[PDB]
Design a protein around this nucleic acid. Sequence first.
RNA 1: AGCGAGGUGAGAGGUGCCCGUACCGCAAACCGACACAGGUAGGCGAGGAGAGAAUCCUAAGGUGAUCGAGAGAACUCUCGU
RNA 2: AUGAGUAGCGAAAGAGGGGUGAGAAUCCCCUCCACCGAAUGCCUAAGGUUUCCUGAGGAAGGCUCGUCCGCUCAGGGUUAGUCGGGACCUAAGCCGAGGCCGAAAGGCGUAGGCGAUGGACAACAGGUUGAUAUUCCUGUACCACCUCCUCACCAUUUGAGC
RNA 3: GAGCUGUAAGCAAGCUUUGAUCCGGAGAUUUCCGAAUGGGGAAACCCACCACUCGUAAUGGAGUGGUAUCCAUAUCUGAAUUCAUAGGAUAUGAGAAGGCAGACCCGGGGAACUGAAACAUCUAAGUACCCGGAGGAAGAGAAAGCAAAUGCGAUUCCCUGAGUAGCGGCGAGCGAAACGGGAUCAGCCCAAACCAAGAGGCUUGCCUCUUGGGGUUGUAGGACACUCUGUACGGAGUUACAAAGGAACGAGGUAGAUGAAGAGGUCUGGAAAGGCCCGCCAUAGGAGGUAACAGCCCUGUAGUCAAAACUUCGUUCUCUCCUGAGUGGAUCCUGAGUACGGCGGAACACGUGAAAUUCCGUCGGAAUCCGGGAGGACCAUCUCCCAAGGCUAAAUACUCCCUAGUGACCGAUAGUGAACCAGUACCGUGAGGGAAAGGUGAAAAGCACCCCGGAAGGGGAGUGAAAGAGAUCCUGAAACCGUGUGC
Lengths: 101, 65, 58, 90
Amino acid sequence: MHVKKGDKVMVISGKDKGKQGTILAAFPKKDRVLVEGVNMVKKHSKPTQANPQGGISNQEAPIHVSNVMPLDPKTGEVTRVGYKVEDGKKVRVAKKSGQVL
Amino acid sequence: MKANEIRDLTTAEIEQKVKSLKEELFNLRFQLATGQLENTARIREVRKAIARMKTVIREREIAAN
Amino acid sequence: RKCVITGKKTTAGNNRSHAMNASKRTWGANLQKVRILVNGKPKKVYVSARALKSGKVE
Amino acid sequence: KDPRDVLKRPVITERSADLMTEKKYTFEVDVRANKTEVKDAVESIFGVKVDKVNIMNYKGKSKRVGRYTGMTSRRRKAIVKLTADSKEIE
RNA sequence: AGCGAGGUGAGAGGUGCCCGUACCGCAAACCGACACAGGUAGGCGAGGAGAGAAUCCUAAGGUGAUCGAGAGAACUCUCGU
RNA sequence: AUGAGUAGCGAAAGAGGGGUGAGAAUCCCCUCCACCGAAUGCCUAAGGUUUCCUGAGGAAGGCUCGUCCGCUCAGGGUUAGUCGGGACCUAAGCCGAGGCCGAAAGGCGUAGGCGAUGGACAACAGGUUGAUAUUCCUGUACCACCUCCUCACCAUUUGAGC
RNA sequence: GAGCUGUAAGCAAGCUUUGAUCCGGAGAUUUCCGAAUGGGGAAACCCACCACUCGUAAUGGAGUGGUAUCCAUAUCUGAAUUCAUAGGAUAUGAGAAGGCAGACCCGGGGAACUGAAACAUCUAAGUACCCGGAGGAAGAGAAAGCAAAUGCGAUUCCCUGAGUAGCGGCGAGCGAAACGGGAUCAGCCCAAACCAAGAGGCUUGCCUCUUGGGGUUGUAGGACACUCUGUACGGAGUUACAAAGGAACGAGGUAGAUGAAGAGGUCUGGAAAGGCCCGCCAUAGGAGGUAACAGCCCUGUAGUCAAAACUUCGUUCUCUCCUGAGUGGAUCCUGAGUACGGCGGAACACGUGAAAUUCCGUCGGAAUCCGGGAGGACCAUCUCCCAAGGCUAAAUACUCCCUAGUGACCGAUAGUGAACCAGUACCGUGAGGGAAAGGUGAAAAGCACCCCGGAAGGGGAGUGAAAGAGAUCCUGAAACCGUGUGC
């Protein structure tokens, strides 16, 4: 995955285009990601224990990373990723620049 | 832990630890069967600990030979 | 069943009657059980006459 | 070999309750072990003496989950009768 | 024969392992494709009448049997005159 | 699909009152009646392999129904020195070192060993739970073995004893 | 380099940048059965002995290791029997056993149906099948040859020759080889005389028994006598030519890393990879995925890099081992119950025929360099060649498997029997036989809540682009089943 948890990523496709948000969780086995304020679907839950009232909650669903891209830290613009070494460990780096992350 | 048990002594110290952990595990299984227990990760942890604590011994012997 | 010396065996083949009617048969060997030593141990073993001729011990 | 490895776990039923009232406890055990092994195991662990032992072994109940119809593991349960003038157990 | 420097006997104290142990077993769990009028070794085996384990009725004990009710015709079957 | 809501619903006495339940000819209880009774009763093999007991359920199976079960779910339940069998014996038969034969494979077969349906072998009589019981509990016993011990006897080389 | 404690939703408990999970290499543990091997045994069970250890006042009990047979080697015994032998006892052996991939090959055994329009000879067919041995290949293989020219020079395999020659109840049918052209290339040891040494037997100076050297051949060679020569200068090697090892280097495999270019705009749409207008990269437009058809979204591709450790190959070095040229023509050696022959059989394309050749069985049985064998009966001449001893890679055959990738190959009655927990369920005493069964949606967002109902199942509501999508969940035909109605 070209994306981690706790990013400031940008959306590409779906209903929620032109959109930004951080990540709540990743799912590499499925190649999917949660995002705040995105794909906030409604779920019908029954009055079962640990909220035994049920009701219709509203919560974010996952989406596929390929429909998601990170941002140039400089311009706040969409970028693609390369990788680079600095002091050993690799780091994500944004095309449009040599800027990290 | 590897470094720790490889530092410790083969026959007395480490085997004492083994039997101590096995007593612990025994009590764990009783607590579990009774339902007096919450932390179940301990069991897996202890069993794996005994495995490493024994294989260090085995490699010490085969080093002897 | 074989000659210890040569390894002769009871080999197989055909029997072609008049009119060349074929039937399976075996040609055996003229083995004879005789007292003779392998290394020691005079052993009373089979051996063929074609071997025994020209001076081998018995 | 170790007594801790001999014994496996207890059996909590109303039967076992009724029996520990009468000082004879129960367990379940590895299938290979025997009566004297378990006796010395108890004596070495809990520091308690024994009047006798009575031992059993059950087969594996067949079960069903969806199409799948495996069998339960076997069991070797052992009733031990403490003496009087002997300790109890937690 | 051989072993044979400590034995014999009695008492007291003590040890005594593994497998099986449920349930059906002339049956709806076994063999017969079936909750099949069949077959299934062996032990016990009551009373009156009775020679008798026959037979009829009954004990101990066990069953009322896996579709029914309702008319009571031809015909079929099993029966009685 | 037709046949056709036809044949069949697999020997054999059931009836009623109560109850349960959403719902009852069909389940439970009671009372009567009826059948077996050298058997349809008690034990127990082989075999089956959880069908046992309890509590829930009634989609399927039950030749109908079903509140029910030899069905489904959960749980639980089978306690041995003396019972049966192994640590004892062997028959038939089988295996079979070496060996004897034999194109090979293999066959035969000694010593030896497996092998019960037989032989030998120490525990019974009362309770006990929903389900085990000459196995558990209570009493009283027996068999084999061992000596940290006590006693009696005998003898250490003709030296008792095994 | 951040999620992860699988399928599998899940609550619980917990772990992880002090770097987990995951991937790869090398290791450790590795219950019981099974060749199964302490003995037994109805498979996964039972019962022991010897040492050591735990434990018991003691037995009783537990744990660790060993304890099969056969074979080889060594030792101690070594009976009837005196030596002596058999036999027995013990210790060493990474011995060999058994399995397989249903394929390839080498051999021993070896059918019938069928065809011949019957049928026995013949075919089918040396197939199937069984058995024993193997190896990654096997087998064959360096001339007692092909042949018949101013000759070719190991085997193997391919194309031809050729459906020819030929064989055959001269029927049905079977069916070559050589030449030639090609792939691959490779040649070498031994016995033997002879010598040196040793041993016993005394065959009393003869013997074979051993070790070593020596020598390996056909217009003959070798031994033996002569000269020449060389002892590591150089040369060959673990694939034969003798066997056993070590290092270094290079390349590669077994995990991986990097890796260009657009959310371009706008129209629909539930959602753009699509349409229209525009740009860009390219040693990268291979593929797959992403809410629909993506070179520029993701993983990736091309290209370039990378390995601690284990492995494959190659090079070099160490390491090892190494002799070969001629002339002589006294004598000696050159593979013995074979070579052939008779009688029975078989294989050779070649069925006993005129039947060469090769092999098997029995019986007989030779020369041995002035020698011997073949050239399709056989004899003579001529030509070619030296049997009865062995080794030898490559070219060739096959694929259970692994990796990578292809298809004018299938697309759920097809294609593996098997796209799903299948050699399962099920059937059968047994060998053995042997199925059926795919699709929610992009995503569970899988139907809160209200009513009917005991439930099931419905009607609303809600989610969703769609609920006529609702758990046999894309479409959903026909047979069949029904409702209503125009005539």
